[PDB]
């Protein structure tokens, strides 16, 4: 009854009926087959007792209106027929709701995502609250799956293709004001009078006057549709490289709907949804989605956390400003910087100020908001005011004895229950702790500069680390809009550990007379954003070599880099953007073309002979390097869970999402076939391609990776 029929009807004293939406499962209002069945009964009952003013829909929950269509049931489909049937029934149900002659109003508060807009686009009038929490948007293309239920072709009709197309292709979030200006929502009200305002909007009868569009959308059908579609297709092909499905299908289905009627659009969307949910990319993206949701819901440690209200940062510069901006502007925690030099404090403050002023120049934040946010950051050069900081993040040069000095003095001049986090990337955590009064409260919080860009962080405990410390650190990293990962304390950690062979083989191939365009295109074609050499240019060549000497010292010659290349650039300092005088020169004429490549860099490196092989060879060799390193590290329980490692690899390095991550990649490629590939690569190239023992074991015995994957 009440549990099953989440669409409870209630007719008020007047001629208006209100329908609540309270799914008894959890706080998100999801869509299930049971709801699709029961809404037919509710609407049939509504057909009884005719001659009433209208109906309204309400969230009846404090946070959202409708989260979106449940994807768990979608995973239970088998062929295209089931998906087409589900899409057909959804389209029919929306059409039936749209087929009523009385006023139907959707009063939306909170999140309304996914197929919810479908229902919202089914109703004749929509009203939304002004809360910043509420938002409008269609986020299913990012899940690699078109949201076909009717709104795919209703939205372009309601609002011009100039915006609807980019809403569908790049499913994003819409403010209440943006929707009101655009014409998506008729009116905006405060939350208090939401139900009432919807009621009198329903009482007004039949607005038989469609608002006019920009009149530039009349291009669809006659001349103008072809030009716009061709241009957006070319743009998408240049952008996504054409390895992403569910992009040209959207263009085709929108064209068919607009220039062949709404029935044609319905059937085309039904068939496309049927055939497209079974593409491997779809379940790859769904798997990544599930993993991310699980790790966000993961509590990390099993102990209760500790309160955290103030945070300290030792050292300053570009990086310290990054941690400060993330901790203050995002999580809203007071932060105190302690650079010894006032210039460092000035640098950190200037970095944060530049970020927020750039945000405001867009007119996205009020000028008062800048002050209210900068109020959280305060610098100094002494130890006063540090006596009540729960967390301290250390971000100065990585000299060992220097770090023992820092930990000694933070123990001397701070609280007793406070915990010490080090932003180290080279030295062992236990060694940094070594001797200390409270070693159980020392943790490693490895970041990735630029801090505001890469959303992955690493949590590194050591031999003695109280579970409360891990819990607190994980909760902080969550509050900062990052993705915490627990990593065993081993040399090289995880991310850069597997990143090193990538750049290593890139340099090895570059030595063999290869051109910039070939290598860059080969790596970006295989779903990798920002190819290798400009990755080094971004991070800086000085950091490009990183601390790989410790990698050799720990794991032999496997990580050994070719000589006279890192040496040949450090002496003739070419740091990319750190000194500006990289091999991607700036200030070119126009500044509207690809970054120029120096001619003398090839003579600077050995550049022996002339290049060989082809792009597939490059892609396969680099990818199998990362795969072998990843299976190697997961062999010794570096990473607690297979999904944790896979999400880290896909989400911090930039592994192709449509491949689902390294573990998804090997599971798809299967078994000893890739093993034979890598022995033949080793034989034709060298001993670097020796397979991991667990790799050959799993390949020969046919074991799986994702539990019962195979």
């Amino acid at each position: 009854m009440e549990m099953t029929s989440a669409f409870t009807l209630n007719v008020r004293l007047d001629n208006i009926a209100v329908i609540t939406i309270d799914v008894p499962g959890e706080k998100m209002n999801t869509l299930k087959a049971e709801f699709a069945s029961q809404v037919r009964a509710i609407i049939k009952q509504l057909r009884e007792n005719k001659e009433l003013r209208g109906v309204v829909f309400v969230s009846a929950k404090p946070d959202n209106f409708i989260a979106g269509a449940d994807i768990n049931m979608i995973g239970n489909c088998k062929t295209a027929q089931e998906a087409e049937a589900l899409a057909r029934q959804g389209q029919q149900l929306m059409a039936e709701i749209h087929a009523l002659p009385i006023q139907v109003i959707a009063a939306i508060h909170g999140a309304c995502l996914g197929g919810g807009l479908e229902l919202a686009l089914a109703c004749h009038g929509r009203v939304c609250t002004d809360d910043p929490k509420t938002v409008l948007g269609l986020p299913e293309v990012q899940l690699g799956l078109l949201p076909g239920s009717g709104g795919t072709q209703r939205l372009p009709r309601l609002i011009g293709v100039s915006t609807a197309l980019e809403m569908i292709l790049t499913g994003k979030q819409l403010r209440a004001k943006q929707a009101l200006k655009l014409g998506l929502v008729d009116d905006v009200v405060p939350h208090s009078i939401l139900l009432e305002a919807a009621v009198e909007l329903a009482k007004k009868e039949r607005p038989s006057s469609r608002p006019l569009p920009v009149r530039e959308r009349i291009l669809a059908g006659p001349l103008g549709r072809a030009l716009l579609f061709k241009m957006v297709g070319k743009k998408t092909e240049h952008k996504t490289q054409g390895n992403y499905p569910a992009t040209e299908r959207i263009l085709e289905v929108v064209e068919t709907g607009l220039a062949q009627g709404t029935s044609s659009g319905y059937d085309a969307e039904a068939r496309a949804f049927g055939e497209l949910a079974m593409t491997p990319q779809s379940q790859a993206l769904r798997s990544i989605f599930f993993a991310s949701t699980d790790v966000k819901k993961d509590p990390g440690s099993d102990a209760p956390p500790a309160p955290l209200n103030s945070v300290g940062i030792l050292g300053g510069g570009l990086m310290g400003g990054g941690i400060a901006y993330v901790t203050a502007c995002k999580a809203g925690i007071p932060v105190r910087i302690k650079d010894i030099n006032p210039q460092g404090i000035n640098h950190a403050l200037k970095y944060s100020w530049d970020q927020l002023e750039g945000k405001v120049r867009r007119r996205h934040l009020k000028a008062s908001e800048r002050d209210k946010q900068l109020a959280l950051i305060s610098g100094t050069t002494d130890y006063r005011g540090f006596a009540h900081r729960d967390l301290i993040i250390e971000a100065v040069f990585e000299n060992l004895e220097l770090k023992q000095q820092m930990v000694a003095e933070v123990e001397q001049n701070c609280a007793a229950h406070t915990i010490f986090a080090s932003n180290t990337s080279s030295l062992p955590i236990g060694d940094i702790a070594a001797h200390a009064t409270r070693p159980e409260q020392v943790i490693g919080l490895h970041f990735f500069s630029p801090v505001e860009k890469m959303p992955l962080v690493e949590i590194i405990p050591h031999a003695g680390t109280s579970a409360q410390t891990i819990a607190t650190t994980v909760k902080l990293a969550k509050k900062q809009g990052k993705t915490p990962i627990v990593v065993r304390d081993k040399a090289g950690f995880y991310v850069n550990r597997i990143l090193a062979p990538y750049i290593n083989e890139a340099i090895r191939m570059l030595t063999q007379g290869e051109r910039v365009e070939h290598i860059d295109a080969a790596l970006v074609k295989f779903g990798f954003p920002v190819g290798p050499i400009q990755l080094l240019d971004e991070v800086g060549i000085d950091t490009g070599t990183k601390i790989i000497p410790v990698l050799e010292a720990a794991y032999g010659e496997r990580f050994s880099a070719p000589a006279n290349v890192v040496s040949s650039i450090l002496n003739d300092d070419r740091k990319g953007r750190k000194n500006g005088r990289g091999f991607y020169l700036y200030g070119q004429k126009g500044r509207k073309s690809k970054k120029q490549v120096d001619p003398a860099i090839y003579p600077l490196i050995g550049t022996q002979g002339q290049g060989r092989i082809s792009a597939p060879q490059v892609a396969e060799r680099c990818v199998m390097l990362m795969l072998n390193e990843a299976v190697r590290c997961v062999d010794e329980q570096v990473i607690r869970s297979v999904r944790d490692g896979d999400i880290g690899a896909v989400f911090g390095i930039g592994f192709p999402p449509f491949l689902g991550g390294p573990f998804r990649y090997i599971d798809s490629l299967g078994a000893g076939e890739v093993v034979a590939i890598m022995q033949r690569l080793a034989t034709q190239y060298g001993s670097r391609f020796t397979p991991c023992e667990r790799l050959v074991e799993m390949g020969a015995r046919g074991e799986s990776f994702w539990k019962t994957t195979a």
Partner: protein, 436 residues
């Protein structure tokens, strides 16, 4: 005595209150037009001294303050002392606490007087919304400072080279909060929406306030509190408040456009107080000093309290927070409180305030107190009307309430009056008066 704090002096004498005075209030254009804010205070102070038997040498310090502020003469109390006929040895002093300025002035005088440093003082406030300081654009001030500091002639032309756009246009004054950008009335619209105040639930309060005020003038009960202002043109004197319109029917101003929302704006212009001009003052004096120079005290003072709340939603709930604290400090109860008062800067907000003091949940969670602070009877609430009638000079509406309340308790022959007010920035003030 876990909560009560007496307001007695070190010698054991209570803080008596002696006469007060009020310039009749006017709209921002009718009279007082061009009359600055300083000389209104000069009028009221000078003719308040020239109304009782006190020699001017007894007064030892006067405190005024003004919200709308003129750049010249920042410390207007000194010009009040200097311009009028007073001993030039009085410690003139100025404060500013938005619409509760007069309350703060009285509190400062009372605490300094009970500290022992003073034996008699003047506390009040003057305000004029007709001499608005219209400043130039912010950009066209750094240019002026630079050209003042500019050394060579060729530097000045290079400096004015950047003078462009509409920087010449003056900047109108802003009533919106500095840090919120809320127009002080649109923070009442959402309050009305939240607590469900109907445009018919209000607009009856405005009617009952225009009445009991037109009736108050007609009875002439407020004759001894109001001056008869004389204006330097001296065309004709001003004797009665012109804002009051105690003749309109409640069905006449039910047909008005909403002011701020203009879509669901259950508050409008008629049920909101208009900007006015005026001044008011009160003579504070310790009981011993009043007795030894032969003067009957017009009541006393019992306790006071000031409070702040977050300015992001419903900042106008100041009286709700302040009142229980004042009551607990005076050792009293809402039940045993003959007559109360409210600022009623808007229709609603005041009604919301009564609803809140009547609600047990609010005092249960938002204050931590066991029980609600009590409900207010209509008859014992704004007996002589309220600010939806006379007007609202920002810095003057404080002392006016004290004078009126003391006189009304004088007519009723006893009781403990109570006065509350809310101010911009989420500031609320309350105080308990005792007319013997």
């Amino acid at each position: 005595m876990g909560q009560v704090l007496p307001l007695v002096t070190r010698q054991g004498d209570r803080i008596a209150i002696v006469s007060g005075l009020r310039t009749p209030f006017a709209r921002q254009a009718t009279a007082f037009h061009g009359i600055p804010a300083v000389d209104l205070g000069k009028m009221v102070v000078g003719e308040l001294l020239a109304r009782s038997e006190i020699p001017a040498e007894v007064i030892e310090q006067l405190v005024f303050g003004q919200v709308v502020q003129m750049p010249e003469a920042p410390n207007i109390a000194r010009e009040i002392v200097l311009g009028t006929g007073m001993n030039v040895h009085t410690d003139a002093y100025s404060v500013s606490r938005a619409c509760a300025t007069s309350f703060q002035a009285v509190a400062n005088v009372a605490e300094s007087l009970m500290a022992g440093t003073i034996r008699a003082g003047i506390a009040g406030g003057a305000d004029s919304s007709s001499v608005l300081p219209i400043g130039v654009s912010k950009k066209l001030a750094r240019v002026l400072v630079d050209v003042n500091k500019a050394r060579t002639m060729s530097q000045r032309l290079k400096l004015f080279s950047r003078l462009r756009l509409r920087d010449l246009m003056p900047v109108p004054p802003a009533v919106a909060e500095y840090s919120t950008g809320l127009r002080m009335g649109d923070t009442a619209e959402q309050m009305a929406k939240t607590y469900g105040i109907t445009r018919e639930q209000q607009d009856a309060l405005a009617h009952r306030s225009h009445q009991r005020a037109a009736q108050a003038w007609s009875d002439g009960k407020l004759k001894e509190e109001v001056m008869t202002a004389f204006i330097p043109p001296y065309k004709q004197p001003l004797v009665e408040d012109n804002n009051i319109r105690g003749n309109s029917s409640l069905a006449d101003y039910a047909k008005l456009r909403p002011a701020f929302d203009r879509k669901h704006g259950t508050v409008t212009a008629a049920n909101s107080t208009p900007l006015t001009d005026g001044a008011a003052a009160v003579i504070l004096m310790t009981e011993s000093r009043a007795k030894e120079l032969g003067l009957v005290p017009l009541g006393y003072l019992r306790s006071y309290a000031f409070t702040a709340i977050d300015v992001w939603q419903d900042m106008l709930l100041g009286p709700a927070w302040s009142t229980p604290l004042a009551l607990e400090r005076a050792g009293l109860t809402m039940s045993d409180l003959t007559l109360i008062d409210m600022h009623e800067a808007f229709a609603a907000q005041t009604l919301a305030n009564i609803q809140l003091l009547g609600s047990e949940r609010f005092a249960r969670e938002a204050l931590g107190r066991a029980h609600a602070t009590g409900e207010v009877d209509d008859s014992k609430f704004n007996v002589l009307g309220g600010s939806i009638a006379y007007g609202h000079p920002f810095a003057a509406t404080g002392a006016r309430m004290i004078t009126q309340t003391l006189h009304e308790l004088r007519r009723r022959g006893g009781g403990f009056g109570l006065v509350t007010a809310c101010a911009a920035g989420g500031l609320g003030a309350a105080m308990v008066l005792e007319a013997e």
